[PDB]
């Protein structure tokens, strides 16, 4: 079954219009090689070409408007995660539900990063009301936070643990590999950020009753 032009597109199911062999009529249809199907995938917008988490985490590495450097660092992080052995999940630190098995993370470094950030990200934030808990003390009350605020707090914890670690080697991969190693320690449950996540969750459970405190509902109603 030797293929030839007169039967290539017919037997291969490829569109001759897409290849320009038999273009359309521009004077009638307006196009020459077919119209892209709408709506377009989000990744085709030049301002949203990168993943939401990757693009968000990259600009957190940026300093002094050096986005090109932070973009190469994120490329080194995803390259390190792609060459590291599959992680060993810890039952004590259950990752976000619905995540893929550990065997799939290495070849999918973007999900490796996403699963890590979305797993240690807290679910609540502690806001304080000035002078409503007693003798000048504040009334701390938990509140939920959107995704961008959850990922931002998580990845900033990771960078805080990274900057405090000592130097290991030389070259252009120092900071990149040092961050990637912390991303792996998070998925394996042996990282230090898990303590900061549980520490803020305790404050939420220890103050879940302040949502209806008498002070928060008697500001100026005791004339």
């Amino acid at each position: 079954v030797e293929v030839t032009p007169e039967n290539a597109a017919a037997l291969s199911q490829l569109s001759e219009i897409a290849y320009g062999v038999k273009a359309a009529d521009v004077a009638i249809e307006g196009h020459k090689y077919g119209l892209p199907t709408l709506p377009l995938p989000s990744e085709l917008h030049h301002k949203y070409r990168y993943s939401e988490v990757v693009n968000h985490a990259t600009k957190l590495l940026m300093k002094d408007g050096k986005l090109s450097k932070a973009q190469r660092d994120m490329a080194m992080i995803l390259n390190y995660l792609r060459s590291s052995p599959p992680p060993k999940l810890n039952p004590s630190r259950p990752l976000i539900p619905g995540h893929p098995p550990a065997s799939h993370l290495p070849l999918n470094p973007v999900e490796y990063l996403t699963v890590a950030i979305d797993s240690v990200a807290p679910l609540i934030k502690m806001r304080g009301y000035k002078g409503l808990a007693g003798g000048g003390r504040s009334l701390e009350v938990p509140q939920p936070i959107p995704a961008r605020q959850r990922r931002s707090t998580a990845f900033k914890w990771i960078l805080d643990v990274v900057n405090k670690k000592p130097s290991k080697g030389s070259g252009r991969t120092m900071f990149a590999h040092r961050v990637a190693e912390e991303i792996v320690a998070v998925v394996e449950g042996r990282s230090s950020v898990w303590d900061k996540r549980m520490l803020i969750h305790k404050l939420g459970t220890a103050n879940r009753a302040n949502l209806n405190s008498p002070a928060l509902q008697l500001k100026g109603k005791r004339f």
Partner: protein, 88 residues
Amino acid sequence: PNKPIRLPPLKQLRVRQANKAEENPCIAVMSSVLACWASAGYNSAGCATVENALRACMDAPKPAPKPNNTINYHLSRFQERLTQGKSK
């Protein structure tokens, strides 16, 4: 039992909050999440569902506000006719 009194002359007859200031529909969901952590623990698996519901809150858009209630306009029309007068 007596009947409602006839209000005395007021400067203005109106309700403070015309539209019901409904509460954030997810502050109740968070309380459920905080309730599981107190009974089942933080890193437990039972609370794995409520957490997904909490994450579903902020990913959804905020419902738009309702049009203003015209109650105060009609209260101001019938003030003098419904009360003992209007204070100056």
